[PDB]
Design the sequence.
């Protein structure tokens, strides 16, 4: 009874995370386009962003997706510091709307990660008495 239903919860909370990560990856091409419009010579940061998108696209496991998401968040923070050198970019409405949507997704991921890891703990705890231990959403070193 409980294993099936606890497994069920783990999976439903996981899809909340996946839905946000997918939206994150989806917004990235538009962002890159907007940045290139104002700052074509900031190639390193645009590459870092593209790389983290691909990592997110290829992630197989919760740990890999979390690591990929942290790489993205870090590259987004670095983009924002760089944007200070480009006032017209910093003021661009599409750029602001996009960094705001991206921050919103990440803030959602924060909540959804706590719900997921809560369901992972109950689940893993129950199985310690077809049902495999699940990974926590967290980036390892
Ligand atoms: Cl972010």
Sequence:
């Amino acid at each position: 009874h409980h294993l099936v239903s606890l497994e069920q919860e783990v999976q439903e909370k996981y899809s909340q995370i996946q839905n946000q990560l997918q939206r994150r990856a989806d917004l990235i091409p538009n962002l890159v386009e907007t940045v290139k419009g104002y700052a074509a010579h900031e190639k390193e940061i645009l590459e870092e962003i593209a790389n983290a998108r691909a990592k997110l696209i290829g992630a197989k496991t919760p740990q890999e997706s979390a690591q990929a998401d942290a790489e993205l968040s870090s590259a987004l923070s670095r983009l924002l510091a760089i944007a200070e050198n480009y006032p017209n970019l910093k003021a661009d409405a599409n750029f602001r709307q996009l960094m705001d949507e991206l921050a919103g997704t990440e803030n959602r991921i924060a909540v959804a990660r706590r719900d997921y890891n809560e369901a992972v703990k109950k689940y893993n705890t129950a199985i310690k008495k077809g049902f495999e231990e699940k990974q926590y959403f967290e980036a390892k070193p």
